[PDB]
Enzyme design. Sequence first.
Site, mmCIF file in Angstrom:
data_model
loop_
_atom_site.group_PDB
_atom_site.id
_atom_site.type_symbol
_atom_site.label_atom_id
_atom_site.label_comp_id
_atom_site.label_asym_id
_atom_site.label_seq_id
_atom_site.Cartn_x
_atom_site.Cartn_y
_atom_site.Cartn_z
ATOM 1 N N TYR A 129 0.831 -1.194 0.000
ATOM 2 C CA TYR A 129 0.000 0.000 0.000
ATOM 3 C C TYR A 129 0.869 1.250 0.000
ATOM 4 C CZ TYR A 129 0.628 0.867 5.075
ATOM 5 O OH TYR A 129 1.150 1.054 6.327
ATOM 6 N N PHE A 155 1.044 9.669 3.852
ATOM 7 C CA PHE A 155 1.101 9.541 5.303
ATOM 8 C C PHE A 155 1.557 8.174 5.778
ATOM 9 C CE2 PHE A 155 -2.738 7.005 5.796
ATOM 10 C CZ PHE A 155 -3.441 7.316 4.646
ATOM 11 N N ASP A 156 1.429 7.129 4.969
ATOM 12 C CA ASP A 156 1.792 5.794 5.409
ATOM 13 C C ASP A 156 2.096 4.960 4.176
ATOM 14 O OD1 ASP A 156 2.340 3.723 7.062
ATOM 15 O OD2 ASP A 156 0.289 3.426 7.788
ATOM 16 N N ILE A 187 -8.828 -0.532 8.420
ATOM 17 C CA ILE A 187 -10.037 0.280 8.388
ATOM 18 C C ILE A 187 -10.968 -0.238 7.303
ATOM 19 C CG2 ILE A 187 -8.972 2.328 9.361
ATOM 20 C CD1 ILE A 187 -8.650 3.300 6.397
ATOM 21 N N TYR A 236 -11.515 7.888 10.203
ATOM 22 C CA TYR A 236 -11.121 8.918 11.162
ATOM 23 C C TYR A 236 -11.846 10.241 10.934
ATOM 24 C CZ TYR A 236 -7.294 5.764 12.439
ATOM 25 O OH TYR A 236 -6.556 4.677 12.850
ATOM 26 N N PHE A 247 -5.321 5.863 -1.454
ATOM 27 C CA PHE A 247 -4.402 4.743 -1.292
ATOM 28 C C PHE A 247 -4.025 4.148 -2.638
ATOM 29 C CE2 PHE A 247 -6.501 4.873 2.807
ATOM 30 C CZ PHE A 247 -5.448 4.692 3.672
#
Length: 107
Positions: A26, A36-37, A56, A82, A99
């Site tokens: 991912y 962010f990730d 999630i 979130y 994503f």
Amino acid sequence: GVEIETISPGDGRTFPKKGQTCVVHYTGMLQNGKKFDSSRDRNKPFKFRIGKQEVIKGFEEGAAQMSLGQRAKLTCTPDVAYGATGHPGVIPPNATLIFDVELLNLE
């Protein structure tokens, strides 16, 4: 709401099932924002299973709608991860998350 825009190549049939530990390279992104990730940055391609709500709902529902090799593109709604809470320092409240999901899985 999971909007899938699969970049075509893959197999189209190896779907993740329940309890299948599946592998996703991912790459996260914010709408009008940066990453962010990233499992690509960690080079640890996030061996996660289906059916435990570890991930999630915007990332879980996108996984079962893909197959092996396919390269989809999540547009995660805020209210599934979130939207009111927000993560401290990573994800603000009411964020529509992006994503780069490519299902190159196992099991």
